[PDB]
Structures are given as C-alpha cells and as structure tokens.
Amino acid sequence: AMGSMERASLIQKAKLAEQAERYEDMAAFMKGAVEKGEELSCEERNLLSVAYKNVVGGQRAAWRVLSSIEQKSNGPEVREYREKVETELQGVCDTVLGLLDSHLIKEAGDAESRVFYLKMKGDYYRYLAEVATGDDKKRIIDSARSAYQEAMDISKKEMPPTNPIRLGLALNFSVFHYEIANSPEEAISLAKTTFDEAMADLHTLSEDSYKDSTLIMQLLRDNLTLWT
Amino acid sequence: AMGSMERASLIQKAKLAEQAERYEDMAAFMKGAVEKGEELSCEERNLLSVAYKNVVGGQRAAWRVLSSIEQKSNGPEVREYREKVETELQGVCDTVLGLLDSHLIKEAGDAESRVFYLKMKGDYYRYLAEVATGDDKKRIIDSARSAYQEAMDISKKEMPPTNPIRLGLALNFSVFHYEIANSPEEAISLAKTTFDEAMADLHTLSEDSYKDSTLIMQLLRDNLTLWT
Ligand SMILES: [Cl-]
Ligand SMILES: [Cl-]
Ligand SMILES: [Cl-]
Ligand SMILES: [Cl-]
Ligand SMILES: [Cl-]
Ligand SMILES: [Cl-]
Ligand SMILES: [Mg+2]
Ligand SMILES: [Mg+2]
Ligand SMILES: [Mg+2]
Ligand SMILES: [Mg+2]
C-alpha cells in the first residue's frame, strides 16, 4: 500500500514514526522503501532494523506472557489467543525474511551491508525458532545457524574486532547458542573471545568509536555475568 | 470480526490481552463483547474503558509529537503523517462513541453505569476536540460539555462525594474546562470543591474505599498544584 509514495517520503515518514514511537507504521514505511528496489544506506538499514525489532519485540514479550499463563493452565481461550499472537509474530518474521531474500542480501556486496542483513536473517529465524516445536524447530534452528555463521565468516575476514555490527552479530549468535541451540559453552566461549579481541583493538579507536564499541562489549559482559 | 466468538470468551481474551499489554486486541475483544447486545457489568465496563484509553492514549501522544514537529516546520510529509495519525485517532473515538450511542447509554439505568458511560462520552468528545479546529471544534466542545454535564448532574444526585467514578468524572470535566474550554477558573473551582467535599466524606469509608478515593483526590490535588 506504499507503492504510490516516493522513496524519500517513506524514509522521512519512517523517521517521524520513530520519533512518535509508532513502530508498526515505521516498519510499514521501511518495507515500502525496501520494495522500491534500490539498495539501503547505512542509516536506512538501521531504520529498517529498529522498526522491525520493536514490532517483533512487542510480539515476543506478549507471546511469553501468554505462554506462561498457558503452561500454568496445564477452556481453549489462552491457547487460542497465544496461537493468534504467535501467528502474527510468524507473519512479521516471514515479512522481514522475505525482504532480505527479495532482494536485499543478494544485492549487498559490501561487508557492512552483507553482515548486517545476514545478522537480521539469523535473528528473525531465531525468533521463529522460539515459538517452533519439533523437527519443525530443527530446520528453523539450522536456518538461523547458517545465516549467523555466514555473517560471522565475513565479519572475521572483513571487519575489525571492534566493529559494532561485528560485535552485535557475535552477541546475538552467542544468545542463539545459549537460548536456542542448548550450547551454553559455545555461547560463553564466543562471548568471551569476542570481548577479549575487541578489548585488544580499542586502542585504535577515536573517542566516539570507543563509546560505540564499549557499549556492545558491556552487553557481552552482561551476558557472561548472567551465564556464569 | 468477533461475531462468532462467545461473549464470555471475548471477556476472557480481553483480560489476557490486558496482561500481555496488547491494548488494540483488548479493545477489539471488548467491542465484540459490547456488540453482543447485553449490558456490561462493573468489571466489564472497566475493561472497555482501560482498553480504549490505552489505544487512544498512544494515538494522542503520537499526534502531539507530530503536531509539535509540524508547528516547528511552520515538504508535505509531516502534515500528511500527522493527518494519518489524526484520522486513526478520530476513527477510534468515533468507534467508542458509536458503542456508547448503540446502545450502552440508553440501556444504562443505574447511576453507576450511566455516569460511567456519560463520562466516557465526555472524554472521547474531548479527544476529538483536541484535534479539531474552527466551528467544527465548537460543536464538538459542546458535545463533550453536554455529556460531562449530564454525568455530573446524575453523580451529584445519586452518588456520595467520595465515589471514585464521581471523582474521576469531576477530575476529567475540570481538565476539559482547563485544556479545552479555556475556562481555567471553572477548572480550578470544580477541582477544589470536589476535593473538599470528598475530604469531608472520607470518615464514612472502609480502609479499602479510603485508598480508592484518596488516590483520585491526589490527582485533583496534582492538577490544582499545576494550575495554581
Ligand atoms: Cl522481547
Ligand atoms: Cl483469539
Ligand atoms: Cl553482490
Ligand atoms: Cl496521552
Ligand atoms: Cl502518511
Ligand atoms: Cl434505562
Ligand atoms: Mg520516485
Ligand atoms: Mg550492491
Ligand atoms: Mg452465546
Ligand atoms: Mg438497564
């Protein structure tokens, strides 16, 4: 429904929606921007990520509330409503994965862009995995793993160890290991090696880049504290 | 789209949506419950009010953000997006007013129910007034006034001065006077008389009712402090 709006107007309205904390509108404006077919700039990639992370973040928090109530109960209403929220969440994940597959990833040739979109692919498969069960859960877990792994391979070859997207990728792949793949040792090892390699590279950074990197290193630290 | 769901199931799902902070779902479930045609209990009236107050509250906060940006700017994008939010807000207000008019108010014979719904009618016209301009603004302001005034007349005849809905009605009618009707003296007079008459009636209340009443008296107090 955004096909008649100018790309630049969609981007401007995404930024306005962000200011107004209207994340569903923001995601719809950024979906329309992507569907114009042009590659996204660094700023525009961040708008896309913020919009959907806020939308899906709300759905995940709601799904968790409903799942807890449902598990305690174990009428059809709690299950029915958890399933409705779950379906809506899956639809948002499938929408984001669709944008990545058509055709953000294939056109992304620079390390910054390709790693950013593959991290997103890992994250949205991870969200699908959280609500999945059975073997269904297995192929979804492997899709999240594969995307994270390709992103990690490129980030290690192409980016310094303090690059914020490299750090955030490692952070989320470590959460995948801990929370999804039942590999807490792999999670802890990855977060520790990532933290230590970034610490050794901080001396190369300006004040502002130091601020950006140490913020994400603190997130790695917070997880290690929680997990150990 | 709720016509096939049992009334009791809609109410149960409204309560679940509230727990999950899913207020748009909560409002839709309560709209479906109202549309069953039966009167609402005290608990159900509160669910209806909470759902829509949260939905419209989000829209008002967003509209305010966008209006501020628009006024500072004075391309079409900020105006266009403020108008989109404004239209959505008006649609939610019209939906609530429609439920009150078809047929909650006319079937409400007890003071508690009638005052509750007339206060809601005042509030949703007040929200329409906030975004209205011109003469358009005048008929809307008069509709909010009329609803508040009928509610006040019944509350003074039928309820004690500490009744929480009577207090909340007076609180919101005083905000109407201050913020909409440009009658700050009427606002201050109403909040002060309401506060003083409730204070004189507190001695009649249980511990729990005392807690309920003094909470709203503090809201009256907070406004008087802001306005004086
Ligand atoms: Cl979350
Ligand atoms: Cl449902
Ligand atoms: Cl390429
Ligand atoms: Cl508000
Ligand atoms: Cl718009
Ligand atoms: Cl009646
Ligand atoms: Mg164009
Ligand atoms: Mg390219
Ligand atoms: Mg029935
Ligand atoms: Mg009746």
XYZ file of C-alpha atoms and ligand atoms in Angstrom:
466
model
C 0.000 0.000 0.000
C 3.141 2.224 -0.078
C 3.765 1.794 -3.810
C 2.471 5.303 -4.652
C 4.687 7.120 -2.110
C 8.145 8.461 -3.014
C 11.095 6.549 -1.534
C 12.405 9.697 0.133
C 8.963 10.419 1.660
C 8.749 6.830 3.034
C 12.192 7.312 4.694
C 11.204 10.692 6.118
C 7.921 9.238 7.500
C 9.836 6.266 8.987
C 11.959 8.764 10.950
C 8.821 10.637 12.069
C 7.147 7.345 13.127
C 10.271 6.522 15.178
C 10.005 9.939 16.959
C 6.322 9.217 17.656
C 7.120 5.625 18.847
C 4.831 4.309 16.138
C 6.833 1.217 15.253
C 4.265 -0.650 13.196
C 3.960 2.465 10.950
C 7.735 2.774 10.895
C 8.107 -0.882 9.726
C 5.449 -0.415 7.031
C 7.215 2.743 5.737
C 10.562 0.951 5.687
C 9.017 -2.133 3.969
C 7.714 0.256 1.274
C 11.209 1.847 0.979
C 12.851 -1.572 0.524
C 10.256 -2.525 -2.067
C 11.405 0.387 -4.240
C 14.223 -1.983 -5.226
C 17.227 0.271 -4.507
C 19.936 -0.744 -2.001
C 19.672 0.790 1.503
C 22.230 3.182 3.004
C 23.722 2.610 6.496
C 21.140 4.954 8.043
C 18.262 3.320 6.167
C 19.398 -0.205 7.200
C 19.324 0.952 10.800
C 15.771 2.342 10.357
C 14.611 -0.996 8.925
C 16.213 -2.940 11.809
C 14.887 -0.624 14.573
C 11.339 -0.720 13.152
C 11.019 -4.478 12.967
C 12.939 -5.151 16.167
C 10.476 -3.010 18.050
C 7.431 -4.655 16.391
C 8.651 -8.218 16.880
C 9.998 -7.342 20.360
C 6.447 -6.394 21.465
C 5.030 -9.624 19.982
C 7.703 -11.772 21.654
C 7.050 -10.178 25.072
C 3.287 -10.775 24.635
C 3.805 -14.357 23.434
C 5.925 -15.004 26.531
C 3.225 -13.659 28.863
C 0.557 -15.825 27.158
C 2.807 -18.933 27.017
C 3.449 -18.678 30.775
C -0.284 -18.411 31.503
C -0.964 -21.351 29.153
C 1.682 -23.536 30.789
C 0.234 -22.790 34.248
C -3.247 -23.777 32.998
C -1.732 -27.159 32.016
C -11.192 -23.582 28.139
C -9.446 -23.131 24.772
C -9.117 -19.315 25.111
C -5.496 -18.971 26.378
C -4.233 -21.435 23.757
C -6.322 -19.761 21.044
C -5.077 -16.292 21.911
C -1.400 -17.428 22.281
C -1.775 -19.011 18.788
C -3.184 -15.738 17.364
C -0.218 -13.750 18.767
C 2.140 -16.492 17.596
C 0.725 -16.375 14.050
C 1.068 -12.603 13.908
C 4.693 -12.856 15.109
C 5.445 -15.515 12.473
C 3.908 -13.273 9.847
C 6.187 -10.359 10.820
C 9.240 -12.657 10.795
C 8.273 -14.044 7.374
C 7.819 -10.484 6.060
C 11.317 -9.449 7.186
C 12.881 -12.680 5.842
C 11.085 -12.042 2.565
C 12.594 -8.570 2.290
C 16.058 -9.964 2.998
C 15.562 -12.738 0.375
C 13.929 -10.386 -2.178
C 16.433 -8.947 -2.707
C 18.465 -7.164 -0.001
C 21.044 -9.911 0.648
C 21.766 -10.776 -2.926
C 22.459 -7.137 -3.860
C 24.579 -6.451 -0.736
C 28.219 -6.637 -1.835
C 29.982 -4.599 0.846
C 30.880 -6.310 4.106
C 28.938 -3.773 6.231
C 25.705 -4.363 4.349
C 26.018 -8.101 3.861
C 26.883 -8.820 7.503
C 24.047 -6.504 8.654
C 21.413 -8.355 6.580
C 22.738 -11.861 7.391
C 22.655 -10.984 11.134
C 18.995 -9.910 10.607
C 18.295 -13.216 8.824
C 19.789 -15.089 11.837
C 17.752 -13.012 14.308
C 14.361 -13.465 12.542
C 14.894 -17.207 12.150
C 15.859 -17.211 15.861
C 12.505 -15.559 16.665
C 10.704 -18.177 14.551
C 12.672 -20.850 16.456
C 11.485 -19.533 19.837
C 7.874 -20.434 19.005
C 8.531 -23.523 16.890
C 8.362 -27.094 18.110
C 9.550 -30.497 16.938
C 11.516 -31.132 13.758
C 9.925 -28.014 12.511
C 12.045 -26.371 15.190
C 15.174 -28.181 13.751
C 15.177 -26.858 10.211
C 14.408 -23.346 11.569
C 17.278 -23.582 14.061
C 19.595 -24.682 11.275
C 18.489 -21.747 9.112
C 19.264 -19.306 11.942
C 22.670 -21.018 12.487
C 23.578 -20.924 8.795
C 22.789 -17.206 8.470
C 24.722 -16.306 11.651
C 27.644 -18.480 10.530
C 27.928 -16.873 7.092
C 27.765 -13.418 8.745
C 30.481 -14.427 11.262
C 32.745 -15.717 8.489
C 32.516 -12.427 6.559
C 32.858 -10.242 9.715
C 36.034 -12.000 10.796
C 37.580 -11.616 7.316
C 36.437 -8.050 6.597
C 35.869 -6.058 9.800
C 37.944 -5.090 12.790
C 37.114 -6.867 16.060
C 35.642 -3.661 17.497
C 33.229 -3.020 14.575
C 29.833 -2.530 16.237
C 27.919 -4.758 13.802
C 30.571 -7.489 14.190
C 30.148 -7.218 17.993
C 26.372 -7.216 17.836
C 26.409 -10.210 15.490
C 28.618 -12.140 17.930
C 26.416 -11.055 20.830
C 23.258 -12.419 19.103
C 24.890 -15.596 17.804
C 26.034 -16.276 21.389
C 22.428 -15.744 22.573
C 21.313 -18.166 19.832
C 23.781 -20.754 21.219
C 22.628 -20.251 24.821
C 18.873 -19.913 24.356
C 18.067 -21.848 21.191
C 20.790 -24.396 20.428
C 21.279 -25.592 24.029
C 25.005 -24.920 23.667
C 25.749 -22.726 26.679
C 29.500 -23.492 26.498
C 29.647 -22.338 22.880
C 27.717 -19.207 23.932
C 30.102 -18.393 26.752
C 33.223 -19.135 24.615
C 32.015 -16.926 21.783
C 31.095 -14.018 24.075
C 34.448 -14.228 25.914
C 36.645 -14.449 22.785
C 34.653 -11.606 21.162
C 35.011 -9.431 24.247
C 38.762 -10.100 24.605
C 39.561 -9.494 20.931
C 37.611 -6.218 20.981
C 39.364 -5.089 24.199
C 42.765 -5.564 22.438
C 41.649 -3.390 19.459
C 40.180 -0.471 21.471
C 43.483 1.442 21.408
C 42.926 2.071 17.640
C 39.635 3.952 18.071
C 38.569 7.568 18.378
C 36.599 8.681 21.462
C 33.296 8.287 19.612
C 34.071 4.837 18.138
C 35.379 3.762 21.579
C 31.982 4.741 23.058
C 30.109 2.736 20.312
C 32.237 -0.427 20.770
C 32.438 -0.464 24.572
C 28.617 -0.156 24.770
C 28.219 -3.500 22.966
C 31.135 -5.047 24.827
C 29.149 -4.286 28.009
C 26.226 -6.277 26.591
C 28.623 -9.246 26.073
C 29.842 -8.717 29.637
C 26.259 -8.628 31.000
C 25.501 -11.973 29.361
C 28.706 -13.571 30.648
C 27.754 -12.406 34.143
C 24.275 -13.877 33.770
C 25.589 -17.179 32.326
C 28.478 -17.774 34.737
C -14.988 -9.976 13.101
C -15.793 -11.090 16.697
C -19.394 -12.075 15.946
C -18.611 -15.827 16.018
C -16.873 -15.763 19.431
C -18.767 -16.360 22.691
C -19.273 -13.287 24.892
C -17.539 -14.988 27.809
C -14.555 -15.927 25.593
C -14.255 -12.297 24.347
C -14.166 -11.100 28.008
C -11.596 -13.727 28.967
C -9.396 -12.789 25.953
C -9.742 -9.071 26.828
C -8.278 -9.863 30.268
C -5.462 -11.889 28.664
C -4.730 -9.044 26.187
C -4.522 -6.637 29.155
C -1.943 -8.954 30.857
C 0.036 -9.042 27.595
C -0.256 -5.210 27.165
C -1.971 -5.797 23.844
C -4.431 -2.923 24.039
C -5.614 -2.841 20.447
C -6.571 -6.555 20.791
C -8.150 -5.820 24.155
C -10.311 -3.015 22.629
C -11.371 -5.249 19.725
C -12.381 -8.048 22.156
C -14.344 -5.598 24.292
C -16.003 -4.038 21.183
C -17.119 -7.577 20.235
C -18.435 -8.132 23.812
C -20.460 -4.895 23.691
C -21.843 -5.834 20.291
C -23.415 -8.948 21.826
C -26.115 -6.521 22.990
C -26.167 -7.371 26.718
C -25.441 -4.723 29.384
C -21.890 -4.694 30.831
C -21.040 -5.465 34.463
C -18.823 -3.129 36.557
C -15.748 -5.239 35.754
C -16.578 -5.368 32.044
C -17.133 -1.567 31.886
C -13.683 -1.118 33.369
C -12.168 -3.477 30.745
C -13.814 -1.474 27.949
C -12.543 1.837 29.393
C -8.963 0.592 30.024
C -8.696 -0.872 26.503
C -9.741 2.237 24.632
C -7.987 4.656 26.965
C -4.729 2.894 26.281
C -5.304 2.818 22.487
C -6.374 6.452 22.224
C -3.712 7.482 24.782
C -0.982 6.143 22.439
C -2.534 7.962 19.452
C -2.821 11.245 21.374
C 0.838 11.081 22.484
C 1.908 10.397 18.865
C -0.323 13.165 17.486
C 1.264 15.573 19.971
C 4.795 14.624 18.891
C 3.877 15.085 15.194
C 1.948 18.345 15.818
C 4.981 19.837 17.596
C 7.278 18.888 14.705
C 4.744 20.299 12.213
C 4.427 23.593 14.086
C 8.231 23.967 14.176
C 8.373 23.366 10.397
C 5.959 26.320 10.024
C 7.635 19.042 2.180
C 4.109 17.745 2.866
C 5.300 14.651 4.815
C 4.937 15.856 8.454
C 1.467 17.270 7.751
C 0.477 14.133 5.828
C 1.637 11.807 8.581
C 0.074 13.948 11.396
C -3.208 13.793 9.382
C -2.942 9.976 9.084
C -2.459 9.627 12.874
C -5.224 12.176 13.434
C -7.644 10.237 11.204
C -6.886 6.987 13.004
C -7.471 8.687 16.383
C -10.788 10.126 15.155
C -11.784 6.679 13.967
C -11.127 5.161 17.415
C -13.079 7.982 19.097
C -15.992 7.524 16.675
C -15.962 3.763 17.351
C -16.205 4.276 21.126
C -18.912 6.964 20.749
C -20.795 4.575 18.485
C -20.733 1.851 21.127
C -21.982 4.297 23.753
C -24.787 5.503 21.406
C -25.649 1.964 20.201
C -26.784 1.176 22.791
C -24.835 1.286 26.082
C -26.127 4.646 27.372
C -29.752 4.130 26.574
C -29.862 0.767 28.384
C -27.890 2.028 31.424
C -30.444 2.730 34.158
C -28.333 2.535 37.312
C -26.372 5.605 38.357
C -23.020 3.739 38.358
C -23.420 2.601 34.768
C -24.992 5.740 33.359
C -22.418 8.094 34.896
C -19.582 5.778 33.745
C -20.747 5.823 30.097
C -21.569 9.568 30.043
C -18.069 10.317 31.448
C -16.665 8.169 28.576
C -18.803 10.126 26.086
C -17.354 13.398 27.504
C -13.788 12.048 27.337
C -13.984 10.796 23.702
C -15.568 14.038 22.510
C -12.783 15.825 24.447
C -10.205 13.804 22.472
C -11.970 14.726 19.216
C -11.898 18.370 20.386
C -8.117 18.286 20.911
C -7.534 17.747 17.180
C -10.479 19.748 15.850
C -10.328 23.311 14.605
C -12.772 26.116 13.884
C -16.527 25.900 14.369
C -16.073 22.242 13.905
C -14.223 22.487 17.204
C -17.294 24.324 18.730
C -19.987 21.722 18.219
C -17.531 19.012 19.402
C -16.675 21.020 22.521
C -20.366 21.466 23.238
C -20.959 17.723 22.842
C -18.187 16.970 25.355
C -19.640 19.610 27.751
C -23.185 18.262 27.471
C -22.116 14.678 28.218
C -19.955 15.724 31.202
C -22.763 17.952 32.496
C -25.410 15.221 32.374
C -22.976 12.847 34.143
C -22.243 15.496 36.821
C -25.952 16.098 37.417
C -26.623 12.381 37.992
C -23.453 11.866 40.123
C -24.358 14.704 42.463
C -27.915 13.364 42.916
C -27.075 9.653 43.177
C -23.529 9.077 44.460
C -21.576 10.025 47.537
C -18.886 12.686 47.068
C -16.145 10.084 47.542
C -17.457 7.671 44.853
C -14.439 7.002 42.622
C -16.326 7.422 39.333
C -17.869 10.681 40.615
C -14.335 11.889 41.496
C -12.856 10.794 38.195
C -15.709 12.449 36.300
C -15.075 15.732 38.141
C -11.339 15.376 37.553
C -11.848 14.996 33.757
C -14.530 17.674 33.473
C -12.114 20.047 35.249
C -9.406 19.087 32.713
C -11.952 19.769 29.941
C -12.516 23.262 31.422
C -8.781 23.987 31.708
C -7.484 22.480 28.471
C -10.395 22.648 26.039
C -12.910 25.294 27.115
C -10.341 27.945 28.119
C -12.063 28.226 31.499
C -9.188 27.753 33.938
C -11.157 29.366 36.804
C -14.024 26.919 36.324
C -11.440 24.098 36.258
C -9.807 25.195 39.488
C -13.186 25.815 41.237
C -14.509 22.402 40.257
C -11.349 20.559 41.339
C -11.255 22.409 44.692
C -14.952 21.916 45.562
C -14.725 18.234 44.526
C -11.627 17.702 46.646
C -13.105 19.452 49.712
C -16.449 17.635 49.553
C -14.680 14.274 49.230
C -12.348 15.087 52.164
C -15.450 15.704 54.375
C -16.949 12.287 53.416
C -13.792 10.171 53.946
C -14.738 9.379 57.559
C -17.577 7.135 56.213
C -15.286 4.778 54.276
C -13.581 1.466 54.930
C -9.778 1.225 54.608
C -10.066 -0.090 51.048
C -12.608 2.521 49.862
C -10.493 5.223 51.576
C -7.499 4.053 49.489
C -9.611 4.163 46.235
C -10.988 7.683 46.908
C -7.806 9.328 48.201
C -5.917 8.102 45.093
C -8.212 10.165 42.840
C -8.276 13.069 45.275
C -4.477 13.170 44.824
C -4.991 13.526 41.065
C -7.271 16.551 41.760
C -4.576 17.883 44.091
C -1.845 17.388 41.445
C -3.844 19.422 38.931
C -4.540 22.214 41.423
C -0.803 22.373 42.122
C -0.036 22.554 38.410
C -2.743 25.194 37.758
C -2.062 27.487 40.723
Cl 11.316 -9.308 23.818
Cl -8.062 -15.362 19.690
Cl 26.623 -8.591 -4.584
Cl -1.830 10.970 26.143
Cl 1.251 9.275 5.727
Cl -32.664 2.870 31.161
Mg 10.451 8.191 -7.288
Mg 25.384 -3.976 -4.346
Mg -23.510 -17.250 23.294
Mg -30.672 -1.387 32.056
